[PDB]
Amino acid sequence: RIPPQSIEAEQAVLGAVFLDPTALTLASERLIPEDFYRAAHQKIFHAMLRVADKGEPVDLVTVTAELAALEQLEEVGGVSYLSELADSVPTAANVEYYARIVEEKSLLRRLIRTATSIAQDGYTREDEIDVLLDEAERKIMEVSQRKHSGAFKNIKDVLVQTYDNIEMLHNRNGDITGIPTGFTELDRMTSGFQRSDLIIVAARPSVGKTAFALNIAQNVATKTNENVAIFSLEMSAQQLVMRMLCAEGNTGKLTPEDWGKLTMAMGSLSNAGIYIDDTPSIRVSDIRAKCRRLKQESGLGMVVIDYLQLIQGSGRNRENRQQEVSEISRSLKALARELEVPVIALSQLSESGSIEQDADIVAFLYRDNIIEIIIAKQRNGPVGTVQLAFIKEY
């Protein structure tokens, strides 16, 4: 059988160094010259290591300088190969993943050799068996010892990190663009929802995130003159609206006396600016096209998805809440970006996918009057907890 390797991947990391020296940092972190399958490659990696070792930076000439001293330059294929090697990278960025699979392939390559060694050490080495017992046992435990990935990121950095995070919490206002709820919260804490951002509010039983999401919705509709597209695939259009009216100005089984108070609410939304859509279990695809058409005609602002799960962009096997929900997640992110607006997606719990790694800001809601929003992730911003009184619907 053909031994486990990927000369193409090797070429990728290898040539990625030429493209940038930062590459050789990440590459050497995981890999070691001889850890390359193609002989030439191990030399070209060792050579760039010894040449980047002396202090002198790594250029297409530098690496062929050290490489010339041993005169392996004719062996590796010449500077012709060196250059080709620089073309064979699709993007020096994410060199780690290229190195990764080279670390993997040739790691696994030894697995094969070490075991086959045990097989032979079996047929001939019959003399004493209790020795092999623990012997072949540790040889495999040794093959799991050479995977260089893993570093305890100390405890010192996370201390200074928690500090400049409070120092980042110690600043003045200046909401850049978004203008949400009671300032202290989202607005102040993170300049009111930036553009291209994917936001995630995590609910729980009795989803208050619905009310909270639509409050942010109208507030960004009444206050600013921005158009907020809101996909409520759970509840009906008309339902959402009235729920929003009693929300902004005070019931169910009633005969009202203060119709006016309901008119004050009714009028309040006269500025409008919110385009609401409720068609259930909507394909994420249509979330994009519909949402975008609005932008090109009237102009957007921000989009709110009422229940992140109900989307279920279709396709292949479900695979226990993870696979499809993740491809939908990064579909929202790629969307918020190619739409240049924030997008608040609502979730809840009973690792609900990969949404975390896609989210720019993830926020949870806690309590039991008063309820507090505790934001966990906030790429480029602080951490945080902030409370807003809640009562019945506001």
285-314 binders of a second copy (CB under 8 A): 285-286, 288-290, 292-294, 313-314
Q: How many CB atoms lie within 10 A of CB 172?
A: 5
In the list 39, 78, 163, 370, the residue contacting a second copy (rule: CB under 8 A) is 163
Nearest to 303 by CA among 270, 339, 342, 330: 342
Q: Does 211 bind Au ion (CB under 5 A)?
A: yes
Which of residues 116, 164, 176, 225 is near a second copy by CB under 8 A? 116
Q: Select from Au ion, a second copy, none the partner in contact with residue 252, using the beta carbon and a kind-dependent cut-off of 5 to 8 Å.
A: a second copy
Handedness of CA 21, 22, 23, 25 (dihedral sign): positive
For a second copy, give the closer residue by CB, 203 or 335.
Answer: 335
What is the maximal distance between C-alpha atoms in the chain? 100
Q: Which of 96, 234, 327, 393 is catalytic?
A: 234
Task: Give the contact letters, 191-230, x = binds to a second copy (CB under 8 A), - = no.
Answer: --------------------------------------x-
- When binding is defined by CB under 8 A, the residue of 78, 260, 299, 315 that contacts a second copy is 315
**CA pair distance 373, 346, nearest whole angstrom:** 13
234 is catalytic: yes
Residues 244-283 contacting Au ion, CB under 5 A: 246-247
d(CA 104, CA 35): 10
- Please give the angle made by the CA atoms of 332, 179 and 236, to the nearest 5 degrees: 55
| First CA to last CA distance, the chain | 68
Distance CA 235, CA 170 (A): 40
* Contact partner, 205, from a second copy, Au ion, none, Cβ < 5-8 Å per class: none
Note whether 145 binds a second copy by CB under 8 A: yes
Site for a second copy in 236-275 (CB under 8 A): 236-239, 241-242, 245, 252-255, 259, 262, 266, 269-270, 272-275
Per-residue CA distances from 160 to 150, 153, 163, 374, 383 (Å): 22, 13, 5, 22, 14
Please give the residues from 72 up to 91 whose contact with a second copy meets the rule CB under 8 A: 79, 90-91
Q: How far is CA 144 from CA 122, 147, 203, 351, in A?
A: 21, 6, 41, 27
For residue 265, give the DSSP letter: H
Q: From the CB of 322, what's the least distance to a second copy, in Å?
A: 9
129 binds a second copy (CB under 8 A): yes
Q: Report the distance separating Cα 203 and Cα 200, nearest Å.
A: 10
Binder of residue 301, out of Au ion, a second copy, none (CB less than 5 to 8 A by kind):
none
Residue 214 binds Au ion, judged by CB under 5 A: yes
Of the candidate residues 37, 98, 307, 364, the single one contacting a second copy (CB under 8 A): 98
Binding site for Au ion (CB under 5 A): 211, 214-215, 242-243, 246-247
**Residues known to be catalytic:** 234
